[PDB]
Amino acid sequence: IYYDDDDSDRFYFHVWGGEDIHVGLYKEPVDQDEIREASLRTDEWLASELAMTGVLQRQAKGLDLGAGYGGAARFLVRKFGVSIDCLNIAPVQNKRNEEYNNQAGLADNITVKYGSFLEIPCEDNSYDFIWSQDAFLHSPDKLKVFQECARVLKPRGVMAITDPMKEDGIDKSSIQPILDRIKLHDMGSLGLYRSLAKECGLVTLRTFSRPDSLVHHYSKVKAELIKRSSEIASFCSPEFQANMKRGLEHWIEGGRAGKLTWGGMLFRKSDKI
Amino acid sequence: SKTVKDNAEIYYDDDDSDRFYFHVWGGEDIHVGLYKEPVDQDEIREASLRTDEWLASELAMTGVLQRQAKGLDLGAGYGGAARFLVRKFGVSIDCLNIAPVQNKRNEEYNNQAGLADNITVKYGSFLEIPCEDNSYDFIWSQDAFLHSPDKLKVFQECARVLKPRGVMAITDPMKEDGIDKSSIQPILDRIKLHDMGSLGLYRSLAKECGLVTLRTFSRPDSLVHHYSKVKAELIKRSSEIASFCSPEFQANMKRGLEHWIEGGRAGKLTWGGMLFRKSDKI
């Protein structure tokens, strides 16, 4: 097999604990900004966009696809009083998520579920909303992910998603170095996600493209990886670190070259806005 | 002289549209709003302020909105955004606007506000910004580029007047990338444009001019909600405004509104937002 995603997880957990980090919204001067704070800004931003669609009512039922340690779930529960089902393929993360929810006294509001985006273990028309942050990048079968999302959304339910991606019109051949470093076949784009969503009865409400966030974020991640090199070397090997750095440099350069972006979208399960 | 006259009369549609917006919302300018569900219960004023807060927040994250930073408002209208930015950030704003009655009211509002040392109002065209090279820390333009022909010249002037590493924040009703003009002819005809801006075109033009695209936003939901709410308000105020926004004018405005709404729902049209920086990279 290959262990890069595993060892990437080890590195993220070593630095940030069971606090979930995703691509952040950074404030100038970026050098002095912190990844943790910028990630929180993303959470706040995406939650505020989602709130506007009206789905974040007290007691509304949300699904977190690629929930990690459950950080966004706890953030949403506390802010809006929703309930959240977390879905995540990684049993260790699942155990800690549940531990964190118990400790927080939020276990009656958050359920942690094992499984796959390709086979969501839930009834059709179950959810008022879906929240998915930077998780679709790692699923090969994008149509099937969107079919599953549309299936488990209630009519008029809204999905908010974010994902590192390529720009529309960029060929796989143009981005092969990064795909080699992150061990993916290809990546999504706003154009693809929109047409797929539409095939599944999800209308695009709004989209975002933040290649500046992509560049800032992965620059920051690279600096932290560099800083922690000796400290993590027993479980994140020197050769793994080199490969990860190369991958981060590709995100940064692809972003500056107009090939790659950090995209965000809201969809509603409706034929029309 | 015929051209001046004919163009003046064509332009009564723009003038009477302004009479309508001014009648309801006065000198605090309205642009495409960010609406909260249930949209029918939301107010246009509140949504248009959400847009101003959002755009200003995006701009602030770039570092350009320091006290005494100098910005240029392209298509400033009655100066509402300029007053909003000055009170919030303590920047200085030069407004550039083609409508001299709007400019005069703008100055009057700034004088009453006690903001005349921070806001200047200049008459002119985006094709010939009456300012020196490298003058501005930032440019703000809300829904103004829509009407400009010669989009390349607009972006050339924007880049010229920005300082190095200056930032521009714009919003504009637009067509979706990949939509041919042949497919939005009713709306191009109804509002009298050859073709429309789009995120892809603006990015390409900006890049040609040394402006890198930092981020973009497409909100066809806002486009649909905003024009639906404006149409509802026009119907609400029909008899109240009929002396100065004629019945025939109202019918023409309503048709144009319907075209924006229909194009939004058809996935042909959107409301775009972008930030650029004057630099080779990022």
Side-chain angles (χ1 to χ4, degrees):
Chain A
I1 334 129
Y2 65 85
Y3 296 106
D4 302 80
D5 297 314
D6 291 339
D7 288 354
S8 186
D9 292 341
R10 289 181 186 179
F11 159 75
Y12 273 98
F13 186 78
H14 174 79
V15 181
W16 288 283
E19 215 221 319
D20 297 281
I21 292 298
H22 310 94
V23 178
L25 295 184
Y26 287 85
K27 186 179 287 156
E28 298 277 9
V30 174
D31 88 306
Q32 290 311 292
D33 209 14
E34 295 299 329
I35 290 165
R36 184 198 264 80
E37 283 56 58
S39 191
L40 206 71
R41 286 196 203 100
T42 283
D43 295 345
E44 292 276 6
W45 165 64
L46 193 72
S48 81
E49 293 290 340
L50 192 51
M52 297 285 284
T53 67
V55 299
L56 299 181
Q57 305 296 327
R58 288 282 270 117
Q59 307 190 29
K61 299 190 195 70
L63 174 66
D64 186 338
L65 289 176
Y69 295 95
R74 291 182 287 278
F75 160 78
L76 291 174
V77 169
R78 287 181 158 122
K79 200 173 178 53
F80 299 104
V82 297
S83 73
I84 298 287
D85 290 348
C86 296
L87 188 64
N88 176 359
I89 202 80
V92 172
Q93 295 182 349
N94 291 344
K95 187 188 191 161
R96 299 166 171 161
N97 188 357
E98 284 175 335
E99 297 174 351
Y100 307 143
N101 299 335
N102 288 353
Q103 292 171 6
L106 296 172
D108 289 326
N109 269 254
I110 304 171
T111 303
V112 180
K113 303 186 159 205
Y114 172 85
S116 164
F117 303 172
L118 310 178
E119 197 180 300
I120 304 172
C122 311
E123 307 293 8
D124 303 19
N125 303 300
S126 286
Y127 295 99
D128 299 300
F129 61 99
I130 295 175
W131 171 275
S132 188
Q133 289 183 287
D134 303 345
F136 289 16
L137 177 67
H138 305 292
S139 310
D141 196 347
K142 305 287 198 297
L143 176 57
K144 182 55 166 184
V145 177
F146 280 99
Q147 286 174 325
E148 282 299 280
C149 294
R151 177 181 74 75
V152 308
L153 277 175
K154 287 162 151 185
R156 312 292 305 171
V158 172
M159 173 160 66
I161 61 146
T162 68
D163 209 33
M165 61 192 64
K166 69 190 192 181
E167 287 275 1
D168 283 349
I170 298 287
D171 195 77
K172 167 172 158 73
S173 294
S174 304
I175 54 159
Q176 194 57 57
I178 195 174
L179 299 170
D180 282 355
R181 295 300 175 165
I182 67 179
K183 280 143 177 180
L184 300 174
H185 186 262
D186 205 339
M187 53 178 82
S189 60
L190 292 173
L192 179 62
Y193 283 15
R194 175 172 70 182
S195 59
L196 299 181
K198 178 113 302 222
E199 280 168 40
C200 301
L202 304 171
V203 68
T204 300
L205 300 180
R206 58 191 84 146
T207 71
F208 310 86
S209 182
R210 291 168 189 283
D212 60 353
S213 282
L214 185 76
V215 166
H216 296 145
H217 187 72
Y218 286 120
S219 296
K220 297 288 241 175
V221 170
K222 202 192 169 200
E224 193 68 37
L225 173 61
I226 287 164
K227 195 183 181 323
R228 304 292 196 149
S229 174
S230 68
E231 196 181 286
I232 69 183
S234 67
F235 57 82
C236 291
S237 77
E239 289 179 25
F240 157 81
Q241 294 183 35
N243 184 78
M244 184 165 284
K245 272 189 282 172
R246 310 208 170 91
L248 296 161
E249 286 162 3
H250 288 317
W251 277 118
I252 301 156
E253 300 161 352
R256 296 201 229 253
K259 299 183 175 171
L260 302 174
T261 190
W262 178 57
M265 319 168 76
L266 274 68
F267 306 94
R268 186 176 298 266
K269 193 182 171 167
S270 278
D271 296 346
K272 295 312 163 101
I273 305 159
Chain B
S1 278
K2 172 205 80 287
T3 64
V4 170
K5 189 142 159 341
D6 288 341
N7 295 333
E9 304 204 323
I10 287 181
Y11 192 85
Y12 297 142
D13 287 281
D14 285 2
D15 292 330
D16 286 347
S17 179
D18 196 58
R19 291 182 175 180
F20 167 74
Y21 279 100
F22 186 79
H23 172 73
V24 181
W25 297 287
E28 187 192 346
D29 302 79
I30 301 296
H31 307 91
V32 180
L34 296 177
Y35 292 88
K36 176 172 173 174
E37 294 278 7
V39 175
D40 77 279
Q41 296 303 302
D42 201 15
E43 306 283 6
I44 293 179
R45 169 68 75 210
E46 275 292 81
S48 181
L49 288 161
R50 292 193 201 102
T51 283
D52 298 340
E53 291 287 349
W54 162 66
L55 195 69
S57 180
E58 296 285 348
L59 202 47
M61 295 290 272
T62 75
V64 294
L65 302 178
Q66 305 294 323
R67 303 203 77 68
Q68 300 189 125
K70 197 102 177 294
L72 173 62
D73 183 344
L74 289 178
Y78 298 104
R83 287 179 297 275
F84 170 83
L85 295 177
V86 169
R87 303 179 191 280
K88 189 167 199 74
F89 297 97
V91 290
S92 296
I93 303 284
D94 293 337
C95 296
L96 188 67
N97 198 58
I98 201 69
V101 167
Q102 291 186 340
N103 293 343
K104 295 297 209 287
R105 288 194 200 146
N106 193 352
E107 295 179 307
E108 287 167 355
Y109 296 130
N110 301 333
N111 284 330
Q112 283 183 29
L115 300 170
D117 297 331
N118 280 245
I119 309 166
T120 71
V121 182
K122 315 161 177 286
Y123 169 87
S125 165
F126 310 168
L127 305 180
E128 210 178 298
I129 303 177
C131 312
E132 306 200 47
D133 300 11
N134 303 309
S135 280
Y136 298 101
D137 299 296
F138 68 92
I139 296 171
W140 171 279
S141 185
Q142 287 177 301
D143 303 346
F145 282 21
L146 174 65
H147 307 294
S148 202
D150 207 346
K151 304 276 195 293
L152 178 56
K153 186 56 174 175
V154 178
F155 279 100
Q156 285 173 332
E157 285 294 279
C158 290
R160 182 180 67 79
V161 303
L162 274 171
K163 296 193 221 170
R165 305 197 61 73
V167 173
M168 172 159 73
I170 68 168
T171 70
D172 215 28
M174 37 190 96
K175 69 181 206 191
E176 292 272 4
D177 297 328
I179 278 65
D180 196 80
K181 62 168 143 68
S182 73
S183 132
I184 51 168
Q185 206 51 60
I187 201 176
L188 294 175
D189 282 1
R190 181 51 63 155
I191 76 168
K192 286 84 99 73
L193 260 42
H194 286 334
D195 199 346
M196 208 169 172
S198 61
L199 292 173
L201 175 61
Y202 286 8
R203 177 169 69 175
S204 174
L205 295 175
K207 177 181 168 166
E208 224 189 284
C209 300
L211 308 172
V212 69
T213 296
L214 297 184
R215 60 190 85 141
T216 66
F217 305 85
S218 170
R219 297 176 188 265
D221 62 353
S222 279
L223 188 91
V224 169
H225 294 147
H226 185 66
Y227 289 124
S228 297
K229 299 284 291 181
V230 173
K231 190 173 70 79
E233 192 71 13
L234 170 61
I235 287 166
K236 177 162 183 205
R237 308 271 192 174
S238 183
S239 61
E240 178 185 317
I241 66 179
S243 66
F244 59 83
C245 293
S246 75
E248 284 178 37
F249 163 76
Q250 289 181 44
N252 291 331
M253 191 174 165
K254 187 180 312 172
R255 286 186 283 266
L257 294 170
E258 285 163 0
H259 284 320
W260 281 109
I261 294 160
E262 286 159 10
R265 294 198 151 115
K268 303 192 174 112
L269 305 178
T270 189
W271 179 55
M274 320 173 71
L275 276 82
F276 305 97
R277 186 184 294 277
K278 186 170 168 179
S279 58
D280 188 32
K281 295 288 190 146
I282 300 161

